[PDB]
Amino acid sequence: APVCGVRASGRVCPDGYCCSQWGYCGTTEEYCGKGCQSQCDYNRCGKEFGGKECHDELCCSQYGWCGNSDGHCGEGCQSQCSYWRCGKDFGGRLCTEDMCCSQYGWCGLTDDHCEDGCQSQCDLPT
Amino acid sequence: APVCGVRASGRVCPDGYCCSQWGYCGTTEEYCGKGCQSQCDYNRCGKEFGGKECHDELCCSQYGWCGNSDGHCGEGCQSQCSYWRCGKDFGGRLCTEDMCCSQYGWCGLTDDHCEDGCQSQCDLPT
């Protein structure tokens, strides 16, 4: 049964999640896209959105979208643009998602990131 | 020794992957962003890229980036926009990654998608 929206006493979603047109909470297109009832800006950010920053330390694109693609963290990125950088050369920042910080200062979950020279969170099955 | 790039006699990565400044193959910002040596438009798509479609049936956002996160399959999507849809209203289409098809024709792994009304692949994760 619906947990949010017009079919749920106009209740909103916890943690700022989007309430889907069908009355469920989430952060994907189904919930935040067409038909979203409330808190539809969960994945939005930037100057055009009260200057809000993204959840999960994600980059804010020049179009006010949260994400970690080069389209979000690269040219035009508005905030939290150093999502993929880490280590001694970057204030000792630790990667999110427990990613390994490579010798070159890049977050990743591959062997070459967790192998020789890994700076932090080097745990990786092998 | 590097597997791609100038240090590999100009060899490019397989399957269109980006070659990083360090000579390795990947699809994230480390490989496709600044310093990328070749095949840097791996995640690009749309009108600005010869009408290219995305790999892994991902949606092409209005900004020409491949993905399935919020902002890629909704308004402005250029191609393969039905990534999250499934069910009888869609000819019986099944979800990828073994996701459940909800009663409303949306793919997901949450209880409401796999429970009452689920149309296919309702095997809740264990």
UniProtKB/Swiss-Prot annotation, chains A, B:
Keyword Disulfide bond among UniProt keywords: yes
Gene Ontology biological-process annotations: positive regulation of cell division; positive regulation of mitotic nuclear division
Keywords noted in UniProt: Chitin-binding, Disulfide bond, Lectin, Mitogen, Repeat, Signal
Keyword Ubl conjugation: no
GO molecular function (one): chitin binding
Residues annotated as domain Chitin-binding type-1: 1-42, 43-83, 84-124
SS bonds (residue pairs): C4-C19, C13-C25, C18-C32, C36-C40, C45-C60, C54-C66, C59-C73, C77-C81, C86-C101, C95-C107, C100-C114, C118-C122
Coiled coil location: none
Function of the protein: N-acetyl-D-glucosamine binding lectin. Almost no hemagglutinating activity towards human erythrocytes. Low mitogenic activity towards human peripheral blood lymphocytes.
Subunit-level organization: Homodimer. The homodimers are asymmetric; formed in a 'head-to-tail' fashion via hydrophobic interactions between aromatic residues of the carbohydrate-binding sites of each subunit.
Protein name, as recorded: Lectin-C
Full protein stretch here: 45 to 170 of 194
